[PDB]
Amino acid sequence: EVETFAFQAEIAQLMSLIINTFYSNKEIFLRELISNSSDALDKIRYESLTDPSKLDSGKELHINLIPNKQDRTLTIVDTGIGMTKADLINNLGTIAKSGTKAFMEALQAGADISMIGQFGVGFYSAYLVAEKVTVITKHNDDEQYAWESSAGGSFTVRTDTGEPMGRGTKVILHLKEDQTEYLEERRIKEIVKKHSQFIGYPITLFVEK
Numbered sequence: 001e002v003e004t005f006a007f008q009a010e011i012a013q014l015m016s017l018i019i020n021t022f023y024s025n026k027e028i029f030l031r032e033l034i035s036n037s038s039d040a041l042d043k044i045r046y047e048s049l050t051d052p053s054k055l056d057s058g059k060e061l062h063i064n065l066i067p068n069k070q071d072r073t074l075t076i077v078d079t080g081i082g083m084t085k086a087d088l089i090n091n092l093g094t095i096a097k098s099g100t101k102a103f104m105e106a107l108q109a110g111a112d113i114s115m116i117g118q119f120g121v122g123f124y125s126a127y128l129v130a131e132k133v134t135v136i137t138k139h140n141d142d143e144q145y146a147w148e149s150s151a152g153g154s155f156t157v158r159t160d161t162g163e164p165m166g167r168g169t170k171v172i173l174h175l176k177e178d179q180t181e182y183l184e185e186r187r188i189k190e191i192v193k194k195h196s197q198f199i200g201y202p203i204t205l206f207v208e209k
């Protein structure tokens with residue numbers, strides 16, 4: 001069963017601004033998604049100190065960057081804490097509403113789109129390069145879910161039927177026709193070195209063929 005939900009007004013407004021505003025510094029999307037992955041890895045690592053059984057779903061704490069030219073997708077995989085059904089539909093949207101308001105206020109005041117992460121809504125920077133974003137996630141206290149949105153004011157949530165993940169999040173970016181540079185090895189390496197060189201987890205850039 002595929003469930004369709006309307007984004008809260010502020011989030012729809014944020015997504016429209018990201019999609020329609022002329023802003024050439026699109027590469028910052030990668031540091032934002034890597035930061036979301038790093039925060040999720042920090043959470044599962046901290047939780048495992050008071051409860052070691054929380055690592056039964058996987059001990060390895062890493063980030064994988066998977067480009068696919070055939071499918072025109074860039075996947076950001078992590079073995080972080082993951083997200084529950086409540087996080088995907090309710091919780092994160094509530095936190096994102098207040099963050100969006102502060103960000104849109106800052107933009108009006110003179111701030112730029114690259115400051116998005118300071119407002120905890122960095123995930124949405126994915127729409128600078130992607131026409132569609134698919135989020136596959138598995139949290140210890142819940143089932144494997146697939147969140148998906150091509151913006152337009154709606155998102156879908158379904159129980160995932162694909163390859164079981166163990167624990168973590170996969171952010172699949174269905175790239176815009178003119179944003180294929182983010183599938184090139186040399187371009188991804190450059191971006192990771194420039195904005196994500198001090199991430200406290202191994203970042204593996206998968207190569208194609």
Ligand SMILES: Cc1c2c(n3c1CCOc1cc(C(N)=O)ccc1-3)CC(C)(C)CC2=O
Pocket residue numbers: 036037040078080081082083087088089092093095096120121123135147168169
């Ligand atoms: C806020 C927000 C939002 C999402 N994330 C965040 C910030 C903190 O939680 C996340 C964690 C990870 C991860 N790698 O574990 C990825 C994305 C997110 C994703 C969303 C629920 C589909 C939409 C949203 O509104």
